[PDB]
Amino acid sequence: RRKQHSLLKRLRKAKKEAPPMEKPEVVKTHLRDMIILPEMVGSMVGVYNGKTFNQVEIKPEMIGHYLGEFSITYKPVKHGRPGIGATHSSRFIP
Amino acid sequence: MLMPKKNRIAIYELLFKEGVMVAKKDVHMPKHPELADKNVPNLHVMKAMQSLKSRGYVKEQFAWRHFYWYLTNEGIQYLRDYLHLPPEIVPATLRRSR
Amino acid sequence: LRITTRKTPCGEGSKTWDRFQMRIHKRLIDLHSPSEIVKQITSISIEPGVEVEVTIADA
Amino acid sequence: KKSYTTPKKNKHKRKKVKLAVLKYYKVDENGKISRLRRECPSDECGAGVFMASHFDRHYCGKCCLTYCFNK
Amino acid sequence: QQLYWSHPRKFGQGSRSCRVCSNRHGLIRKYGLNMCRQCFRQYAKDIGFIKLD
Amino acid sequence: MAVQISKKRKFVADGIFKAELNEFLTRELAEDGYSGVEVRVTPTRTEIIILATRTQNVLGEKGRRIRELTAVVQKRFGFPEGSVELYAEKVATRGLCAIAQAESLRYKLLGGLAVRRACYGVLRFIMESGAKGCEVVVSGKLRGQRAKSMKFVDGLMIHSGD
Amino acid sequence: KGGKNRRRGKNENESEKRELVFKEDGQEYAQVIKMLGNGRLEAMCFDGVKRLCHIRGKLRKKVWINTSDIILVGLRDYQDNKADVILKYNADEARSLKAYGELPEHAKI
RNA sequence: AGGAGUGGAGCCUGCGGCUUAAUUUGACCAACACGGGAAACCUCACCCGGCCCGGACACGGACAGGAUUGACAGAUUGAUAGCUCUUUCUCGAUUCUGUGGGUGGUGGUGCAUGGCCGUUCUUAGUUGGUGGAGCGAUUUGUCUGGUUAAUUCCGAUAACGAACGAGACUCUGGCAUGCUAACUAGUUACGCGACCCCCGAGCGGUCGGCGUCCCCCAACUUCUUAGAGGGACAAGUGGCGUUCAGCCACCCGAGAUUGAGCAAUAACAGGUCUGUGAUGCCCUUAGAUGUCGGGGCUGCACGCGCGCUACACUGACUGGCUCAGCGUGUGCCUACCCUACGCCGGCAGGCGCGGGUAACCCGUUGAACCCCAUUCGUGAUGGGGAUCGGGGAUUGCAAUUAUUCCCCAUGAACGAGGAAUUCCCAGUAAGUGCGGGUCAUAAGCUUGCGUUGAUUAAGUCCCUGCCCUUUGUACACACCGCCCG
């Protein structure tokens, strides 16, 4: 416990106060590191990427893993149309 | 502050006694060992000498990450009245060099 | 002592290096005599910058 | 490297409100001095300073990490 | 003011600093260097070395 | 007060003290005709022989400057108190002292004077004082904002071998 | 070019990218119609009026303006038929301007 | 003439293009495993959030019922940043506020510069004085010839006498039973006593053999170590040359070349403002280009470069035998070294003790290829180990886009490689391991070192390129030139 204190109290707290048969709002984090645990389950957590808080519901099937595996931090990728110098042919103009 | 009023004295009095100060370029010094004993947790030596230097009264060299402040006649007069000291005292040095 | 490092700051051009070396030397003379006259005569009569280390006993 | 782009908030340091000073000692008759709330009990406190009358919270401002009664 | 200004630097390339001005990038330790390779060259004449090979 | 560092590391730390000092002094005694140092540790005492041509300006009136310099070293490298002892020295034959000749040309130039006549004036002195030969270079700008080079040479020179 | 040499004595370069005046008063966007020689060139303005465009100092042999493509043209203060080139853009820059909806949506690249 | 490869295949890494909120940036023979640049954080220049001033000094203003400082809790917040707000104590001339003025910047400009480095250029080139020749730009000296690795010498001579580079020099290798001297280096000799086997003559003792302890007030310095010296000079002989300068063969023997360091004149719009408290000018400077948290430099339908591992029987696999060298190591930077020995575990590893400032301890460095004996059998095979699942350890504040290491399982391309192209002449190429560098954890990289050790040449100007002379030129931004319809 190196001031993971801040997270684990908010989760239990928000889970308690929330109506029955309804999930809480969110607790947010810039921390992408913390083991998913049984007690954490049922909460909803937003996880900072570089700008964006991608929200996720915690399953009992996610236990053992980290938070940061369920939020990506890049666009998967598309292409493309090779550019100009994209080879030993691009050159000349005047 | 800028710094306490205690820690001013402890620099200005120490300078008057050796006639010279030296220090290092850091901002993570924890208590400034190597005199001023354990009551300067920050810049304070460098920050107070610079203001003093702006108004003359001292010269400053710098070489390989170390300052060297040389007190001068004008600052001796200032510091003497500023710290309410005898009209003729210099405990820094006073003898002929052979 | 060997130091094998780049000859070029901000590497560009043909890749070159430079071997520097320092050679130290040690040698020792063992005496057995009273410690007084040794420590008297030893520390004097040395012109160059050359170090000396006296030892109480080793044998 | 390039110049700062516009914010829509920024505010620096609060002005630490310009309250009227010393009404903490109450005079109704002399030589009596009618003190209000208790003066601070620590060894490192001088006990010449007042403690906060901050009800539902009771806190020495000379202290800055310790000695917070609340009832 | 603040309650922080620092975070653990205890190992790595940021907790040692080289003597140019507190320059880096140019990772150096050798035989007690703490001395920057660009200036090491300028101290080939100065004492520590004279070039012989 | 112990123990003591490895013999390999013993020489490196001496070299660092020999070198740092030699650039510390050059930034203060530049106008006094600095020419080097020669350090010597002696029995229970340090000697730092501060070679400069004009010992006058180094000394000062009542030895103020020499007193400043000794107090600096006594704090900076953390020397045991009162062990440090400075000495001065005047060199005779000043035209074989390239370091001082170069730094004198500097203040002649930075004083505001022409380059050609300045280079000639320093040249004949170092030739007169004794020397097989001698050389001067000035590389940088003058008469516009493109750089050039100006060589002034007399006598013999070597460039190769040990 | 295809490498060669003597092309470094002089100021490489490049367009560290960048951005973005307009139009201004008599200073607007046109498209290259033809590609004469000698130096001058043709370019129909985007409004509807034709004009004949002229190259400008610097941009001379420092920037090639192939045929077909948007380009920034000042109009002469008094002259109708002849007009004066400025400040070209990039093909990417021109399609961003088109997507913004500031130049007319009529020409393809 | 040949040797081994690259280009082909899988993988690592750098570069371009594409993508992206950011995928920071320099560099295009003389860039591209290069910027010590193997980036978890730091680094960090980039992107997104939050905080701080470390805005000197001057002048004016504020101002001792006072300029000002800090903070609990609650709310807010990634946050336990009094950052903000609620709440109300605390600090006391250090300040705050306005103007003037500074300061910081991995901000820009290497086409404003210093310094350094690379390259032209590893070739033999280069210059002034006095005299001579020309109206002058210039030229002679610096050469027809012989000779050398070399503007190296001989010789010629309107030039004469000189300087820089070449050489000389420094380091390293190769030759010492000569010299100098050694328990922080050895050898020999016994004195030996102890262990061991008769193993050989004899009996087991002794004599001989095997190492270790014992070794000294023993003897010595061959081996090891490092100092002073000597030795190689074309010296001698035979050919050849003007018989000059030199060249070829041979004796002695270490043959006149073992390998490196240092290196001229003049130049380049070569690289570096991101090594520099080197530096001009410009920009920015409180809503900061100066600090904490998170992400990125690793993102892929593609193109190229440097390398690593392979395609088996001259092999793989499992046992057995037996040899080395250059170094390095805690007491350093701020928290950290190299390891013997004992114990526990299949392994990674854990744990208990001890030494090492180092010819002293690790380490008589008990390394690999190689060597000796089993097993496999021409089969994409047990060759190859890519891809991929699960589990165990170590470093750290943190290991996810798997830091590194280990165990079991999974078992791909690849069966000798097009057009092209690189590098190399003797302990050299090639095979093979090790130390140092970066390093909290980690080399497929670079820099050095040992070990095993060939084939082919003793040449030439064909290609590519360079030096000297002569010749031609509309060229001098110098043929990557100029110029015509």
Curated annotation (Swiss-Prot), chain A:
Localization in the cell: Cytoplasm
GO molecular function: MDM2/MDM4 family protein binding; RNA binding; structural constituent of ribosome; ubiquitin ligase inhibitor activity
Residue location of crosslink Glycyl lysine isopeptide (Lys-Gly) (interchain with G-Cter in SUMO2): K59
GO biological processes: positive regulation of signal transduction by p53 class mediator; ribosomal small subunit assembly; ribosomal small subunit export from nucleus; rRNA processing; translation
Record's keyword terms, sorted: Acetylation, Cytoplasm, Isopeptide bond, Ribonucleoprotein, Ribosomal protein, Ubl conjugation
Cellular component GO terms, alphabetical: cytosolic ribosome; cytosolic small ribosomal subunit
Subunit structure: Component of the small ribosomal subunit.
Reported function: Component of the small ribosomal subunit. The ribosome is a large ribonucleoprotein complex responsible for the synthesis of proteins in the cell.
Similarity comment text for this entry: Belongs to the universal ribosomal protein uS19 family.
Annotated protein name in UniProt: Small ribosomal subunit protein uS19
Species of origin: Oryctolagus cuniculus
UniProt lineage: Eukaryota, Metazoa, Chordata, Craniata, Vertebrata
Gene giving rise to this polypeptide: RPS15
Residues of the full protein shown: 50 to 143 of 145
UniProtKB/Swiss-Prot annotation, chain C:
Subcellular location: Cytoplasm
N6-acetyllysine: residues carrying this PTM: K15
PTM annotation, UniProt: Polyubiquitinated by ZNF598 via 'Lys-63'-linked ubiquitin chains when a ribosome has stalled, initiating the ribosome quality control (RQC) pathway to degrade the potentially detrimental aberrant nascent polypeptide. Deubiquitinated by OTUD3 and USP21, antagonizing ZNF598 activity. Ufmylated by UFL1.
Residue list for modification Phosphoserine: S33
Protein family per UniProt: Belongs to the universal ribosomal protein uS10 family.
Cited function: Component of the small ribosomal subunit. The ribosome is a large ribonucleoprotein complex responsible for the synthesis of proteins in the cell.
Assembly, per entry: Component of the 40S small ribosomal subunit.
Protein name: Small ribosomal subunit protein uS10
Gene: RPS20
Included stretch of the parent chain: 61 to 119 of 119
Curated annotation (Swiss-Prot), chain E:
Pfam families documented for this protein: Ribosomal_S14 (PF00253)
Cofactor(s) required for function per UniProt: Zn(2+)
The keyword Phosphoprotein is annotated on this UniProt entry: yes
Cofactor note text: Binds 1 zinc ion per subunit.
GO molecular function: structural constituent of ribosome; zinc ion binding
A GO cellular component annotation in the UniProt record: cytosolic ribosome
Subcellular location(s) of the protein: Cytoplasm, Cytosol; Cytoplasm; Rough endoplasmic reticulum
Modified residues (N6-acetyllysine): K45
GO biological process, one term: cytoplasmic translation
Family to which the UniProt record says this protein belongs: Belongs to the universal ribosomal protein uS14 family.
Assembly mode: Component of the 40S small ribosomal subunit.
Annotated protein name in UniProt: Small ribosomal subunit protein uS14
Gene from which the chain derives: RPS29
From Swiss-Prot, chain F:
Membrane topology annotation: Peripheral membrane protein
Residues bearing the modification Phosphothreonine: T42, T70
Covalent cross-link Glycyl lysine isopeptide (Lys-Gly) (interchain with G-Cter in ubiquitin) as placed by the record, residue numbers: K90
Keyword annotations: Acetylation, Apoptosis, Cell cycle, Cell division, Cytoplasm, Cytoskeleton, DNA damage, DNA repair, DNA-binding, Isopeptide bond, Lyase, Membrane, Methylation, Mitochondrion, Mitochondrion inner membrane, Mitosis, Nucleus, Phosphoprotein, Ribonucleoprotein, Ribosomal protein, RNA-binding, Transcription, Transcription regulation, Translation regulation, Ubl conjugation
Inhibition and activation profile: Endonuclease activity is inhibited by MgCl2 on apurinic/apyrimidinic DNA but not on UV-irradiated DNA.
Post-translational modification: Methylation by PRMT1 is required for import into the nucleolus and for ribosome assembly. Sumoylation by SUMO1 enhances protein stability through increased resistance to proteolysis.
Reaction(s) this enzyme catalyzes, per UniProt: 2'-deoxyribonucleotide-(2'-deoxyribose 5'-phosphate)-2'-deoxyribonucleotide-DNA = a 3'-end 2'-deoxyribonucleotide-(2,3-dehydro-2,3-deoxyribose 5'-phosphate)-DNA + a 5'-end 5'-phospho-2'-deoxyribonucleoside-DNA + H(+)
The keyword Oxidoreductase appears for this protein: no
Top-level taxon in the UniProt lineage: Eukaryota
Gene Ontology biological process terms from the UniProt entry: apoptotic process; cell division; DNA repair; positive regulation of apoptotic signaling pathway; regulation of translation; translation
Modified residues (N6-acetyllysine): K62
E.C. number(s) listed in UniProt: 4.2.99.18
Signal peptide feature range: none
Residues bearing PTM Phosphoserine: S6, S35, S104
Keyword Heme: no
Compartments where found: Cytoplasm; Nucleus; Nucleus, Nucleolus; Mitochondrion inner membrane
Family: Belongs to the universal ribosomal protein uS3 family.
Descriptive protein name: Small ribosomal subunit protein uS3
